[PDB]
């Protein structure tokens, strides 16, 4: 269907339902992690065609970075679901690794057979979607800076943690140059067109009561006249 | 550093009329206007230059004289000038016979000339008209003198061709703070500009060119908004 | 010196009227389509009553032609009527101020396809054909008055005009209607006051600003 519209009879209920899905579910399994990842990919589709923004999605990005590199004092304010699943200094970061590789049911069934390569693949796929969504949404959005600030903190922390990837610092440079280009003017929204002076229209050019008035005036005229004539007769 | 008024929502300033005699405002008058009602038998008609020539000759005046179109376009352009949408001016018609017609800034003129003429004749007879609300009278009629009907602290200037050119923006911006402005504008088609002399303090020019009355009104009005930051 | 479309070099003003209601009819002689001169006729051809405002056109023309910059000689007047006819007005016309004479002159123009004075040295009202840039001068900046378009200040716009850059304005002669008409032609849209205007008052204020800049 046509998703770019503001409201669609069935697309928007799907959006709120899948937002529910993004939000309330607990994150204990890499199955659910990849489930959120593909949920993100499909919202990214919906918004490369519709061009809006999702606070739940940016929250989910934050949460996913934190659950991947949970392995703590930096952000104790996140309430993750899994502390056990963490990636030590064992990543190969070889470019020939697995891509986003959508093998949807296949990935869902083989997820419990979880290699660090699969963890890296889902991580990279998610943050590629994150890069694309950033470059299509947030630099346009005004609050871009404070929107991405937790993302910048996570990315810098993960750089310090690993400093062996490339695409993290790639996104770092992208967002840094973007915020350098931006200006972030203070708000001036409340400004209104003065209301003018009200205007109006002028006026210009009951039959029962009308005929009553005319006949009564006639009668009064006649009574005066007959007075005067009888009086002259008498004199 | 300095807060804002408790409200800032848009709210229209109240209409200005002859009862308020304090706030600085703009007073435009159309003078010497050719406007009167005759009878033909069975009905009353306003004079117009183009259409009533046998009886215009019978009365003896000039076709070139008895023209109220000039009044119509002048009145329309004042009433729909931006300054009224800011709500700061009102107008006074000085009839050729001597009547004063004060035009409230809440009216909407009928734009076609026949409708306008109907309004003028109805006004000349009944002396007033009411609106859709009909809760306040729109077109009122008042006595000599205009000076008795003007804001207390004002100026007395008539826009005459012979008078030296002065830039309206300049002169208005020089005008003092509580100094309201009346301008006596000769609507009459062509002739002398020596009628309001006893009222006025000076004659003023805005160009080395002659002007149409409505255009002169537009220019002076324009300078007024340019001074008053609208 | 009188300006014309043949000279396309000097800096100047061009004023364009949009879809002006200039329509003719015959009853047994001719007549203008006046929304108030007749209503059953309007409903007879079924077209809307509230489109015929030859008055509106008339005072727009009166104000513009009587503006000082006119006989100061710095502009030309073009009108693209509702029916797709371009009307050229030179700076040398003493238009009758009367609307009835205006209507008679307009209908005889519509059926003569030209106006020449009794002097007859050169025409007066030129009935010519679309497009319009065929008669715009070379370096003309095209701007339409749009109510929702941001407000601008006429002087500053004139100084930001180039030295030889002529300037062309597009004003809608129609009371009701959206400003889509000359988007192909216009370079850009501007607003003039924060309270929406009359076409008459808009063109008047704009030409006064023009005179203010060009030291008239």
């Amino acid at each position: 269907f046509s998703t770019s519209d503001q409201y669609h009879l069935v697309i928007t209920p799907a959006l709120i339902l899948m937002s529910q899905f993004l939000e309330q579910i607990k994150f204990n399994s890499l199955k659910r992690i990849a489930f959120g990842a593909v949920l993100v990919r499909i919202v990214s589709q919906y918004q490369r065609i519709s061009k809006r923004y999702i606070p739940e999605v940016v929250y989910f990005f934050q949460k996913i970075l934190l659950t991947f590199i949970v392995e703590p004092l930096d952000f104790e304010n996140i309430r993750l679901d899994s502390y056990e699943l963490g990636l030590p200094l064992d990543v190969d970061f070889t470019k020939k690794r697995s891509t986003i590789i959508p093998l949807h049911t296949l990935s869902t069934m083989d997820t419990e057979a979880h290699p660090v390569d699969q963890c890296v693949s889902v991580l990279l796929n998610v943050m590629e979607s994150l890069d694309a969504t950033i470059s299509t949404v947030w630099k346009s959005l005004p609050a871009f800076n404070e929107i991405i600030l937790p993302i910048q903190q996570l990315l810098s922390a993960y750089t310090s943690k690993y400093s062996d990837f490339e695409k993290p610092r790639n996104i770092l440079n992208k967002v840094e140059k973007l915020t350098k280009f931006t200006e972030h003017i203070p708000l001036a929204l409340q400004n209104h067109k003065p209301v003018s002076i009200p205007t109006h229209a002028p006026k210009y050019e009951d039959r029962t009561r009308s005929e009553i008035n005319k006949m009564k005036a006639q009668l009064k005229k006649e009574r005066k006249f007959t007075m005067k004539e009888i009086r002259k007769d008498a004199k | 550093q300095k807060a804002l008024p408790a409200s800032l929502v848009p709210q229209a300033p109240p209409v200005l009329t002859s009862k308020d005699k304090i706030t600085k405002r703009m007073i435009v008058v159309l003078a010497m206007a050719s406007l009167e009602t005759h009878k033909i038998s069975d009905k009353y008609v306003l004079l117009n230059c183009d259409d009533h020539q046998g009886l215009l000759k019978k009365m003896g005046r000039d076709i070139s004289e008895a023209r109220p179109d000039i009044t119509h376009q002048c009145l329309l352009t004042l009433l729909d000038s931006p300054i009224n949408k800011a709500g700061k001016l009102q107008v006074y018609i000085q009839t050729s016979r001597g009547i004063l017609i004060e035009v409230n800034p809440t009216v909407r003129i009928p734009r076609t000339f026949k409708r306008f003429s109907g309004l003028m004749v109805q006004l000349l007879h009944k002396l007033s008209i009411r609106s859709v609300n009909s809760e306040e009278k729109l077109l009122k009629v008042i006595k000599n003198p205009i000076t008795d009907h003007l804001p207390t602290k004002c100026r007395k200037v008539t826009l005459s061709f012979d008078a030296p050119v002065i830039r309206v923006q300049d002169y208005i911006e020089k005008l003092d703070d509580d100094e309201s402005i009346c301008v006596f504008v000769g609507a009459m088609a062509r002739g002398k500009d020596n009628f309001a002399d006893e009222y006025v303090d000076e004659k003023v020019g805005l160009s080395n060119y002659p002007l149409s009355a409505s255009v002169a009104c537009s220019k002076f009005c324009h300078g007024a908004e340019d001074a008053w930051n609208i | 010196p009188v300006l014309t479309s043949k000279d396309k070099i000097t800096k100047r003003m061009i004023v364009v009227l949009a879809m002006a209601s200039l329509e003719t009819h015959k009853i047994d002689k001719y007549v203008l389509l006046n929304c108030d001169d007749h209503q059953g006729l309007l409903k007879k051809m079924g077209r809307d009553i509230s489109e015929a405002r030859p008055d509106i056109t008339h005072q727009c023309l009166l104000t513009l032609l009587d503006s000082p910059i006119n006989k100061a000689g710095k502009l030309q007047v073009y009108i693209q009527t509702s029916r797709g006819i371009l009307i050229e007005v030179n700076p040398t016309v003493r238009i009758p101020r009367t609307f009835k004479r205006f209507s008679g002159l307009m209908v005889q123009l519509l059926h003569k396809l030209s106006i020449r004075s009794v002097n007859s040295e050169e025409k007066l009202l030129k009935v010519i054909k679309n497009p319009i840039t065929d008669h715009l001068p070379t370096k003309c900046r095209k701007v339409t008055l749009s109510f929702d378009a941001p407000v601008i200040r006429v002087q500053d716009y004139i100084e930001k005009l180039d030295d030889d850059e002529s300037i062309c304005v597009f004003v809608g002669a129609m009371a009701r209607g959206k400003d889509n008409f000359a988007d192909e032609y216009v370079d850009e849209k501007v607003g003039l006051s924060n309270y929406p205007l009359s076409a008459s008052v808009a063109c008047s204020k704009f030409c006064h600003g023009a005179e203010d800049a060009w030291n008239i």
Binding site: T199, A201 | D80, P110 | S50, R53, A175, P196, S198
Partner: peptide, 10 residues
Amino acid sequence: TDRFKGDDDI
């Protein structure tokens, strides 16, 4: 409610 639209009729 009224802006550059003339008047109604009867």
